[PDB]
Design a protein around this motif. Structure first.
Motif, PDB file in Angstrom:
ATOM      1  N   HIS A 213       0.815  -1.205   0.000  1.00 41.87           N
ATOM      2  CA  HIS A 213       0.000   0.000   0.000  1.00 41.87           C
ATOM      3  C   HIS A 213       0.852   1.260   0.000  1.00 41.87           C
ATOM      4  CE1 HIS A 213      -3.309   2.700   0.566  1.00 41.87           C
ATOM      5  NE2 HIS A 213      -2.912   3.068   1.772  1.00 41.87           N
ATOM      6  N   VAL A 214       1.790   1.342   0.940  1.00 45.25           N
ATOM      7  CA  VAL A 214       2.670   2.502   1.061  1.00 45.25           C
ATOM      8  C   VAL A 214       3.336   2.865  -0.266  1.00 45.25           C
ATOM      9  CG1 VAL A 214       4.708   3.461   2.188  1.00 45.25           C
ATOM     10  CG2 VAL A 214       3.130   2.024   3.486  1.00 45.25           C
ATOM     11  N   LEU A 215       4.028   1.897  -0.857  1.00 46.74           N
ATOM     12  CA  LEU A 215       4.719   2.094  -2.126  1.00 46.74           C
ATOM     13  C   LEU A 215       3.800   2.591  -3.223  1.00 46.74           C
ATOM     14  CD1 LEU A 215       7.042  -1.043  -2.233  1.00 46.74           C
ATOM     15  CD2 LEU A 215       7.680   1.339  -1.816  1.00 46.74           C
ATOM     16  N   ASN A 216       2.686   1.895  -3.418  1.00 49.46           N
ATOM     17  CA  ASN A 216       1.724   2.265  -4.449  1.00 49.46           C
ATOM     18  C   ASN A 216       1.154   3.649  -4.202  1.00 49.46           C
ATOM     19  OD1 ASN A 216       0.785  -1.130  -4.897  1.00 49.46           O
ATOM     20  ND2 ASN A 216       1.591   0.206  -6.509  1.00 49.46           N
ATOM     21  N   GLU A 217       0.853   3.946  -2.943  1.00 53.29           N
ATOM     22  CA  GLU A 217       0.314   5.250  -2.562  1.00 53.29           C
ATOM     23  C   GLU A 217       1.370   6.300  -2.922  1.00 53.29           C
ATOM     24  OE1 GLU A 217      -2.998   5.464  -0.536  1.00 53.29           O
ATOM     25  OE2 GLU A 217      -2.705   7.189  -1.862  1.00 53.29           O
ATOM     26  N   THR A 257       7.202  -8.769  -7.989  1.00 54.78           N
ATOM     27  CA  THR A 257       6.748  -9.765  -7.030  1.00 54.78           C
ATOM     28  C   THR A 257       7.259  -9.482  -5.613  1.00 54.78           C
ATOM     29  OG1 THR A 257       8.603 -11.311  -7.411  1.00 54.78           O
ATOM     30  CG2 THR A 257       6.731 -11.463  -8.896  1.00 54.78           C
ATOM     31  N   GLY A 258       8.364  -8.754  -5.520  1.00 64.33           N
ATOM     32  CA  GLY A 258       8.937  -8.451  -4.226  1.00 64.33           C
ATOM     33  C   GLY A 258       8.474  -7.149  -3.612  1.00 64.33           C
ATOM     34  N   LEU A 259       7.985  -6.227  -4.434  1.00 68.83           N
ATOM     35  CA  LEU A 259       7.518  -4.948  -3.914  1.00 68.83           C
ATOM     36  C   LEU A 259       6.019  -4.763  -4.053  1.00 68.83           C
ATOM     37  CD1 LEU A 259      10.275  -2.472  -5.062  1.00 68.83           C
ATOM     38  CD2 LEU A 259      10.023  -3.602  -2.845  1.00 68.83           C
ATOM     39  N   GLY A 260       5.449  -5.365  -5.090  1.00 68.77           N
ATOM     40  CA  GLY A 260       4.023  -5.248  -5.317  1.00 68.77           C
ATOM     41  C   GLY A 260       3.659  -4.075  -6.201  1.00 68.77           C
ATOM     42  N   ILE A 261       4.510  -3.777  -7.178  1.00 72.44           N
ATOM     43  CA  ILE A 261       4.265  -2.677  -8.100  1.00 72.44           C
ATOM     44  C   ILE A 261       4.045  -3.174  -9.523  1.00 72.44           C
ATOM     45  CG2 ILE A 261       5.400  -0.895  -6.765  1.00 72.44           C
ATOM     46  CD1 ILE A 261       7.948  -1.446  -8.229  1.00 72.44           C
TER      47      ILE A 261
END
Ligand SMILES: Nc1nc2c(ncn2[C@@H]2O[C@H](COP(=O)(O)OP(=O)(O)O)[C@@H](O)[C@H]2O)c(=O)[nH]1
Ligand SMILES: Nc1nc2c(ncn2[C@@H]2O[C@H](COP(=O)(O)OP(=O)(O)O)[C@@H](O)[C@H]2O)c(=O)[nH]1
Lengths: 432, 432
Positions: A213-217, A257-261
């Motif tokens: 969530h944090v990264l994508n946000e 796959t490791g960060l979710g982006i």
């Protein structure tokens, strides 16, 4: 040559060979221009070595190299594996060196847990095997990723529910015992593990956060993010020299796959190519130099285990593997490191073609080791030079034979070189 | 509405929920417009159901759905796992139905091998566990990916060297025996396995090819390639509802690690969103309908195991999970399937918000099952309709309440809907 300001919203540094190419150094230099630096794969098994302004040596394991900059947030993605005991030890070692970590490091709640258990299990495996030798490489990386795949392993989120953590931890404890007789699992030993990580959960709590969530946000808010590659793609579980590879995916796919982006959001990808290859441990090595030429490189580059002091096997730059690696990741540019190590060599060869045991040119890099360990490399000798370049900061100041070198590489590899390392120092980097 | 000709050089279809959303159908429709259709993850455990022009039913497992078109080449990427015995059985079943496969299917040399061993091992696991129940789900998928991570498993390339295949296969045979007492490993049983796959190697040989090289070479030659998603991302080993997930990575990142292509080369990504969710097996299910409303969906959609006939749990479309999934993959568009199943429902709810056990709105989809299994879903009731739409081919011909439905979805999800499935048939698809 504003390479630092040319990078996209979401950039990343990846190793293109085997072993340590010096990605960390680059990440440290590029870090101040990014809002976030995140590690997407692997565990503390790695080890990035970077130096600050004063020339102080720093050896990171799990923490991203951007940790030396105040306005930068380090993130340990969901693709990673965390050995909590070693993690805090790493934190304590940074706090004592004046580097605060409170509120500057995020730990993915979806990242799996590497217990001392995996470490002992990892060791038990080799003890009975053909006997891999001498080295306290008790890195339970392999077994941890296995627990993950098996889906019986624990994750960071579990520490928030110590209630069930107990009966969730004993499950893989029971498993390991059934396998190796060199494991008994005392019910008393379990009690400790629970009370141990119950205390760890208290300390780690402020670090935990929804990494995905944090990264994508962050991306939605236009926050720049630089991804720190764990190891190299030639070491990749799928693309590397199987079985002599790591259980993680150091390739570009792994940052997703490791960060979710989203794959569409990943911009520039800098591939760190060392001037010469270094493979640590047994495995296929085409360009391997067993002669003095190898010894010269090894000493000059200081190719020895940071802990074990064991000499890493060396060789000439393999363009076949590099080109193959370039395709897999889709590098925008490249960072040709340790160029200063080639000084003194009258001739510097480059692995360009790959011939069969009989004499047939291969169109692509071999998958199976059977064919790979039996290849006839076709070199391309280039004019060397005798000049200490650990002081050259501008591109034009380099020797004609050295410039011709990077150029022949970027020509054969297809991807341009934007960074040339001529020293371990933060300052020792040339921009092309 | 030329959606078929809008797709990029390298496109892909991915499931956005749990279980079977009907990706295969879409892949079959879009396949004739592509030069290659490739499966990047999973094994034969899946099962895509597609129908040709005459309305003939086809149930694929490993083979991509584009296999029904002559000018299309099907590829099984390196991310996959191949149970060779079942594979040939699948091939034989296609050859008898007039579909030739010779020279139309590539098998990644870097793809791992799923032996009957993993199947029996998979079973042994549950036999001693809390006792998962009733179902011949002897899919050794989990254990195979484990062997991979462990790096002691075999790959397709090994069949070309039966010499060493013997001493490479016995290694994991020996391993499994040490673990479970319900495994003895006769030296005679090993002899067979070698001679069995020695014969298999003869047949599979013409299929094998450097998947990574071929694909990448294809892109250089501007050959269009459509990637067939294995399962859904909510089932992803990292992003799914762990531990209730698959050992594979069904997300977009997985197409990189499974095929060996650069994240920068991946174009459009169509996310298959079924009109309602269906989770097969135990696990967290927020929108789960245990009442008649669920029974109505189940029967209308025919939510039952293709082999086991067991009813899949059903529920309302979960937008929280969907939105979360949309971010992870970065879908260009969406394919809203099985819309014809919602006919007859007076009211159709949509999971929009997620409340805590107390009443606090969550900003993101929960990682741990602890919090997820204890959520208060906030629906949004919409006007339903009573009209058989399995005949509607144009968008404007749909009911006002049905059009309003897709629109509210694409609004909340953020990604537009380009395909609306109103029937299992190849012809039963609406373009928006
Ligand atoms: N001489 C020299 N050493 C370098 C250069 N770039 C990096 N290094 C050193 O090489 C080592 C690279 O391995 P390490 O940083 O541990 O691995 P990484 O994870 O790939 O960064 C470090 O100790 C660096 O300080 C360079 O241009 N010249
Ligand atoms: N009623 C109905 N069935 C559909 C529709 N689209 C697909 N199906 C069927 O739903 C099932 C979906 O599961 P399947 O295709 O096996 O899974 P996939 O792996 O996600 O493709 C198949 O049997 C399809 O033929 C649709 O629009 N309406």
């Amino acid at each position: 040559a504003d390479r630092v300001s040319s990078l996209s919203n979401v950039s990343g540094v990846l190793g293109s060979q085997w072993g340590d190419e010096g990605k960390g150094k680059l990440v440290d230099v590029l870090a101040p221009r990014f809002d976030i630096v995140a590690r997407c794969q692997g565990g503390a098994n790695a080890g990035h070595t970077i130096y600050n302004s004063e020339g102080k040596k720093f050896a990171l394991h799990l923490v991203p190299s951007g940790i030396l900059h105040e306005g930068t947030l380090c993130v340990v993605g969901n693709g990673a594996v965390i050995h909590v005991p070693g993690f805090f030890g790493e934190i304590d070692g940074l706090q004592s060196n004046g580097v605060s970590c409170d509120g500057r490091i995020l730990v993915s709640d979806r990242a799996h847990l590497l217990f001392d258990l995996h470490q002992t299990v990892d060791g038990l495996r080799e003890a009975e095997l053909a006997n891999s030798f001498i080295g306290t490489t008790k890195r339970g990386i392999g077994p941890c990723y296995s627990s993950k795949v098996t889906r019986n392993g624990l994750r960071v989120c579990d520490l928030r529910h110590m209630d069930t953590f107990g009966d969730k931890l004993d499950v893989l404890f029971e498993d390991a015992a059934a396998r190796f007789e060199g494991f008994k699992y005392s019910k008393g030993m379990l009690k400790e593990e629970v009370e141990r990580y119950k205390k760890f959960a208290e300390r780690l709590e402020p670090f935990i956060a929804d990494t995905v969530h944090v990264l994508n946000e962050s991306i939605r808010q236009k926050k720049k993010i630089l991804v720190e590659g764990g190891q190299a793609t030639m070491l990749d579980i799928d693309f590397g020299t199987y079985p002599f590879v790591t259980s993680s995916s150091p390739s570009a796919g792994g940052i997703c796959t490791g960060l979710g982006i989203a794959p569409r959001v990943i911009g520039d990808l800098i591939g760190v190519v060392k001037a010469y290859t270094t493979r640590v441990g047994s495995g296929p090595f085409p360009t391997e130099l067993l002669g003095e030429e190898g010894d010269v490189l090894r000493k000059a580059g200081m190719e020895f285990g940071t802990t074990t002091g064991r000499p890493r096997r060396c060789g000439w730059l393999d363009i076949v593997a590099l080109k193959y690696c370039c395709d897999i990741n889709g590098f925008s540019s490249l960072n040709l490191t340790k160029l200063d190590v080639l000084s003194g060599l009258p001739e510097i060869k480059l692995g360009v073609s790959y011939n069969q045991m009989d004499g047939e040119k291969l169109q692509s890099f071999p998958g199976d080791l059977d064919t790979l360990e039996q290849v006839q490399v076709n070199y391309e000798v280039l004019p060397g030079w005798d000049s200490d370049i650990s002081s050259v900061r501008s591109y034009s100041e380099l020797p004609q034979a050295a410039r011709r070198y990077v150029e022949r590489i970027e020509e054969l590899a297809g991807v341009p070189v934007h960074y040339i390392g001529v020293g371990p120092g933060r300052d020792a980097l040339i921009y092309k």
